[PDB]
Amino acid sequence: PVIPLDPARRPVIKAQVDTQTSHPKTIEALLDTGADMTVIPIALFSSNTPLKNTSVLGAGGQTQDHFKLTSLPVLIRLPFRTTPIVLTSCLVDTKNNWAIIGRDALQQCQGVLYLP
């Protein structure tokens, strides 16, 4: 589908996220061309899985306690599409409720940005 760009209406999508730590979950995620890596809420991971340490830069400066890093690949499926997007590693938001589809996933699904 063609998704219009609107400052008042964020470009969201419903995507099934398989973290391979629990059961695959359909969540609402922001489509983000500014993001390099995909951000997945920590609420989808099991309580006993190890996550790597890292630091990420953003608006309110950088941080090292806000984001973590997956130990296992994350599979992401789109609404009617059936083959999953395979991300070797992706960011994990441990504080807020953040689901962000980055360019890493937007590449495998042939996603592009068009300017008339």
Place this chain on the structure above:
Amino acid sequence: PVIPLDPARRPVIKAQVDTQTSHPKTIEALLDTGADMTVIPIALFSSNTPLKNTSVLGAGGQTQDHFKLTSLPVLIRLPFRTTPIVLTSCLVDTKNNWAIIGRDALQQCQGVLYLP
């Protein structure tokens, strides 16, 4: 043009920005569909130049200090189209000097996100 999406290569673009407080300048801006409002470097604005205090959400939570708000509209020109993008107001990065094209500007040039 059709801008491809790649995690290893940011969707940057050259744009001419007029802050109406000084000489119009050329910057390299990041095409960001996740940004509600456009962010321009404070290095564009003259030294005086009243700017408003504002609060912005991003990476390391919310920030009371990083971003300011323009008092006057911001003229933005792109390589292709001859007519300029007119934003009523946009964000100003004081800490760093990021150039980020949000959906506010992408709407006025009718930019869309295409997912096959």
